[PDB]
Amino acid sequence: GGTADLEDNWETLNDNLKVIEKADNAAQVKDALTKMRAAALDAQKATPPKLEDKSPDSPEMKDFRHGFDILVGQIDDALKLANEGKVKEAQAAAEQLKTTRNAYIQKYLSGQCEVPLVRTDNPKSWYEDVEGCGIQCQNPLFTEAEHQDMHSYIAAFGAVTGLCTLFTLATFVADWRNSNRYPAVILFYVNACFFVGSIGWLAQFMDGARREIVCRADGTMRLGEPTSNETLSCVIIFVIVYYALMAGVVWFVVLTYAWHTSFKALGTTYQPLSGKTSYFHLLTWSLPFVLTVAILAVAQVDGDSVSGICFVGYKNYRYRAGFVLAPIGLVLIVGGYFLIRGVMTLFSIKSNHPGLLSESKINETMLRLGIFGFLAFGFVLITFSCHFYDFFNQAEWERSFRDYVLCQADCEIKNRPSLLVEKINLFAMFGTGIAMSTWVWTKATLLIWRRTWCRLT
Amino acid sequence: GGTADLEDNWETLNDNLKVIEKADNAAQVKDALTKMRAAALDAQKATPPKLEDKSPDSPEMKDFRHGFDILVGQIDDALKLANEGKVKEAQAAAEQLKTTRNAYIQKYLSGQCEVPLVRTDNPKSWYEDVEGCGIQCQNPLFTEAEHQDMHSYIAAFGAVTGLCTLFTLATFVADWRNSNRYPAVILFYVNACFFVGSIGWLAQFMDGARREIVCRADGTMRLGEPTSNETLSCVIIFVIVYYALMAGVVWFVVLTYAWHTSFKALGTTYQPLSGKTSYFHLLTWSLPFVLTVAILAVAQVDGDSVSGICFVGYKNYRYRAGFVLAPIGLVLIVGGYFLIRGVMTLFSIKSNHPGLLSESKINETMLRLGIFGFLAFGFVLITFSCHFYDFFNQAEWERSFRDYVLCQADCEIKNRPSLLVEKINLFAMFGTGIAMSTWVWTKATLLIWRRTWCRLT
Numbered sequence: 043g044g045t046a047d048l049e050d051n052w053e054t055l056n057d058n059l060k061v062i063e064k065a066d067n068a069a070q071v072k073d074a075l076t077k078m079r080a081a082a083l084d085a086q087k088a089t090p091p092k093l094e095d096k097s098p099d100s101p102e103m104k105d106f107r108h109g110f111d112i113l114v115g116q117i118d119d120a121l122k123l124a125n126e127g128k129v130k131e132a133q134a135a136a137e138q139l140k141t142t143r144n145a146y147i148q149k150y151l152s153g154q155c156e157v158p159l160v161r162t163d164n165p166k167s168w169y170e171d172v173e174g175c176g177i178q179c180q181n182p183l184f185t186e187a188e189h190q191d192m193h194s195y196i197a198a199f200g201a202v203t204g205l206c207t208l209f210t211l212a213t214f215v216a217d218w219r220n221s222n223r224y225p226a227v228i229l230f231y232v233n234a235c236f237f238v239g240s241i242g243w244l245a246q247f248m249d250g251a252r253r254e255i256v257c258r259a260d261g262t263m264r265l266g267e268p269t270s271n272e273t274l275s276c277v278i279i280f281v282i283v284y285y286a287l288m289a290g291v292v293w294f295v296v297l298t299y300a301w302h303t304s305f306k307a308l309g310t311t312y313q314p315l316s317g318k319t320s321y322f323h324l325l326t327w328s329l330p331f332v333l334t335v336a337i338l339a340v341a342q343v344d345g346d347s348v349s350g351i352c353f354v355g356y357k358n359y360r361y362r363a364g365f366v367l368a369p370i371g372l373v374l375i376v377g378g379y380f381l382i383r384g385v386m387t388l389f390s391i392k393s394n395h396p397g398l399l400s401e402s403k404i405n406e407t408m409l410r411l412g413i414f415g416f417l418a419f420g421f422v423l424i425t426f427s428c429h430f431y432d433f434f435n436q437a438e439w440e441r442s443f444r445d446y447v448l449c450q451a452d453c454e455i456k457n458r459p460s461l462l463v464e465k466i467n468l469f470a471m472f473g474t475g476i477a478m479s480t481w482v483w484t485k486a487t488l489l490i491w492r493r494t495w496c497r498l499t
Numbered sequence: 500g501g502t503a504d505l506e507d508n509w510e511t512l513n514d515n516l517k518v519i520e521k522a523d524n525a526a527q528v529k530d531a532l533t534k535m536r537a538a539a540l541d542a543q544k545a546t547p548p549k550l551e552d553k554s555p556d557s558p559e560m561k562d563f564r565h566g567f568d569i570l571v572g573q574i575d576d577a578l579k580l581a582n583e584g585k586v587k588e589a590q591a592a593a594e595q596l597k598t599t600r601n602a603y604i605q606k607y608l609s610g611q612c613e614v615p616l617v618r619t620d621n622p623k624s625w626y627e628d629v630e631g632c633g634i635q636c637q638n639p640l641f642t643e644a645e646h647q648d649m650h651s652y653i654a655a656f657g658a659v660t661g662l663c664t665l666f667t668l669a670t671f672v673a674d675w676r677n678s679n680r681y682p683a684v685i686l687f688y689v690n691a692c693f694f695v696g697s698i699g700w701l702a703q704f705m706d707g708a709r710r711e712i713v714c715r716a717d718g719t720m721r722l723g724e725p726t727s728n729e730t731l732s733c734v735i736i737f738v739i740v741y742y743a744l745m746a747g748v749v750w751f752v753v754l755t756y757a758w759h760t761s762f763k764a765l766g767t768t769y770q771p772l773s774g775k776t777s778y779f780h781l782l783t784w785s786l787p788f789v790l791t792v793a794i795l796a797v798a799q800v801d802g803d804s805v806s807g808i809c810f811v812g813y814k815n816y817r818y819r820a821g822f823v824l825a826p827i828g829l830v831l832i833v834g835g836y837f838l839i840r841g842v843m844t845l846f847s848i849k850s851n852h853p854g855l856l857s858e859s860k861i862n863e864t865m866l867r868l869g870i871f872g873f874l875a876f877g878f879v880l881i882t883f884s885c886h887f888y889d890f891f892n893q894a895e896w897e898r899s900f901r902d903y904v905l906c907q908a909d910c911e912i913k914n915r916p917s918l919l920v921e922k923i924n925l926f927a928m929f930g931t932g933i934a935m936s937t938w939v940w941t942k943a944t945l946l947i948w949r950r951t952w953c954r955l956t
């Protein structure tokens with residue numbers, strides 16, 4: 043529709059977008075934008091090929107038209123700067139139009155592509171035998187109401203864990219000469235991990251970051267990352283999240299180990315852990331590193347719009363068992379062994395030395411530690427179960443997704459993943475940090491912060 | 500959001516919209532529009548009250564923002580004219596902003612109103628005990644795909660009937676000295692009616708007319724028309740449609756009557772209808788008039804977005820039986836009587852005068868008439884059945900509509916009307932005209948049009 047066809051004006055915008063990129067003076071930059079503005083306004087007068095059947099006042103026609111409202115405003119912001127002779131930054135403002143261009147060309151000049159498949163020229167983004175279509179970034183199995191529901195749940199829980207574990211780090215360093223002692227300082231490193239994990243989980247809430255993390259440049263979803271031309275954003279969120287949570291679950295095994303061995307103090311001033319502290323840092327930081335490095339090697343980092351992060355085994359449930367179920371499983375056997383070895387010792391001390399737990403100081407932090415070890419084991423047990431549910435059921439959910447994608451070209455989805463199971467899972471993973479941070483919710487912490495403010499007068 | 504709240508900037512636009520209406524000079528008109536533009540742009544920066552939960556890039560946020568793109572463009576068209584000192588037409592361009600204002604205030608500053616009920620200050624538009632909400636114009640029981648499907652069906656069929664019956668009128672007047680003879684000229688008046696009916700049915704396809712016909716000024720649907728402040732558009736479409744189709748069904752009874760009585764010619768040059776022609780025009784034009792005048796009296800004209808016209812008994816199935824089922828029913832008993840009286844005569848002539856139907860001229864148009872009478876009776880029989888299905892089932896469809904409206908404040912509709920039954924109905928009502936127009940699809944018509952072009956050389 044209009045003077046020129048929709049595809050013609052879109053090709054005009056594309057050609058002039060590339061001429062700005064390779065332009066020398068403001069005269070040619072200004073020339074492109076003023077011919078681009080004319081094109082956008084003429085393309086706006088048009089009717090897209092699969093919208094002949096739609097009303098002119100329809101939300102589709104109004105949104106197609108709106109794309110050119112966004113584009114003309116952006117053209118004007120670049121046109122203002124090009125008029126200001128500021129070539130450099132005018133080419134930078136013109137680089138913003140590529141976002142609108144890629145989204146609206148995809149939406150309205152879809153071609154052979156029908157939702158959830160989207161128009162993309164990147165052959166690595168193409169789905170099955172379908173030439174030129176890729177699976178849309180936004181998870182087509184979940185509604186906008188459910189996406190927004192998960193985002194709220196993660197924001198609320200992420201922010202709580204974030205601030206709780208941040209305070210516990212602050213309380214520890216505020217009294218580091220005193221608090222940097224084992225087995226107490228284990229909880230500091232556990233809290234460091236959940237804090238770093240939270241930052242990874244809350245990254246999606248930063249203006250437009252969720253798309254930058256989970257979508258490819260072409261609007262298709264992130265798959266088999268690390269991959270060429272794409273940004274590091276996906277893998278950075280993966281590394282932050284996966285390393286931080288895998289390190290934190292190792293420090294949990296360390297906690298259970300420390301609780302079991304600190305029974306050897308016998309209330310007495312002996313330090314059973316003395317000299318063992320070196321291995322604690324070697325195991326907790328080397329073990330998740332080796333795993334992370336291996337995931338980047340196999341390139342099995344995939345993104346999710348509902349989760350908002352990049353993770354291992356989102357598309358391949360096989361890699362999810364080997365890199366999530368297997369470590370969490372193994373942390374439960376080893377951590378579970380030391381807790382059983384801990385209770386065995388407690389009833390052995392109870393028989394051999396009745397009244398040795400007589401009131402305090404050392405004996406008080408001992409049971410607080412054993413409560414934390416059991417409380418954190420319980421949460422690891424819920425995540426393991428949630429991850430297992432996903433693992434043993436993902437094959438059918440993937441077959442239901444193929445059967446829907448392929449049909450969409452009534453047409454509905456048989457089964458899909460459980461957001462309740464993922465929220466139950468998220469609660470346990472955030473709850474391990476919330477519960478672990480309350481290690482510092484002592485009368486002594488009030489003293490630490492009283493002396494901290496006195497020294498800040 | 501922004502400098503001022505959404506409601507504040509919308510109130511600013513409203514106040515300045517009224518100041519333009521009561522303005523004296525261009526300076527104050529120009530002053531309002533430039534303060535209106537600032538408001539629209541600031542209101543565009545805002546987030547509507549029930550859209551805090553929605554993404555900023557969401558289609559809702561993009562459409563809310565788009566309303567101000569439409570408004571600013573309209574403001575500029577009025578601002579261009581006000582700058583041109585053309586106060587008169589600037590106030591006329593400013594009058595266009597009332598359309599956008601009413602639609603977007605309704606959509607995004609909905610208040611206590613939840614779809615399908617819409618925000619309206621007109622108390623005559625308010626639904627049940629709900630204070631300030633009215634039932635939306637667009638039929639909430641039918642999807643945008645089904646609305647667009649009915650519109651296509653009516654356009655295709657309306658245009659065919661329209662052109663077929665237009666040609667038959669043209670063929671008749673092109674040879675009026677010859678063709679203005681009974682019983683043939685009855686088909687001309689039958690075709691006149693279907694043509695006028697088609698124009699009534701095709702009015703909805705004129706740029707934005709469908710809304711002007713079926714919606715109240717406040718965006719609620721047309722009900723109990725004729726009613727104060729509203730335009731005549733609804734009632735004009737009703738009168739055109741109802742009178743034209745009710746007159747056409749009376750001319751059908753006249754046809755059946757004429758076929759029965761023209762048996763009294765006996766091939767012979769006697770004109771049985773001679774002098775009876777006066778009553779034919781008295782009955783066919785007075786009878787639908789009396790009915791139309793009575794519908795406007797009881798004020799039972801309601802509009803429909805899926806049908807696109809205004810009609811009797813859309814909301815009250817009772818009035819639909821009395822003004823549609825009752826006349827169509829009665830036209831079937833009287834028209835049916837004369838067809839049975841016609842066949843009775845044919846077999847009486849066959850017995851009393853074997854070989855009187857020996858070949859032509861008068862005997863040829865006689866059977867063509869009896870085929871038309873039976874062919875048109877068949878179609879009246881389908882519409883009667885379709886109207887009856889609607890009548891005896893509308894009470895539950897209305898209870899399902901209340902139960903949905905009231906719930907919407909999952910939530911779905913139990914049962915709704917049948918578009919197949921209405922399309923079957925439409926086919927028969929359009930088909931009566933299509934079949935009736937083929938009266939003129941004779942070898943003789945080619946002669947008429949050959950002599951018409953010769954006289955146009």
Ligand SMILES: Cc1nn(-c2ccccc2)c(C)c1/C=N/N1CCN(Cc2ccccc2)CC1
Nearest residue numbers: 287348349353421422425464467468470471474
């Ligand atoms: C990723 C991911 N994505 N989603 C997820 C979220 C929303 C929608 C769709 C999917 C979920 C629920 C996860 C869970 N990851 N695990 C949780 C267990 N943790 C180890 C661990 C950490 C602390 C305590 C105990 C165990 C590893 C990461």
Ligand SMILES: Cc1nn(-c2ccccc2)c(C)c1/C=N/N1CCN(Cc2ccccc2)CC1
Nearest residue numbers: 744805806810878879882921924925927928931
């Ligand atoms: C109005 C209306 N609205 N709708 C309708 C259309 C779409 C959706 C929802 C509803 C329908 C199907 C109608 C039907 N009206 N009758 C048809 C019968 N005719 C008398 C008649 C005329 C010629 C031949 C035989 C009979 C009176 C008007």
Ligand SMILES: [Zn+2]
Nearest residue numbers: 390391394395
């Ligand atoms: Zn002992």
Ligand SMILES: [Zn+2]
Nearest residue numbers: 108111565568
């Ligand atoms: Zn817009």
Ligand SMILES: [Zn+2]
Nearest residue numbers: 847848851852
């Ligand atoms: Zn006889």
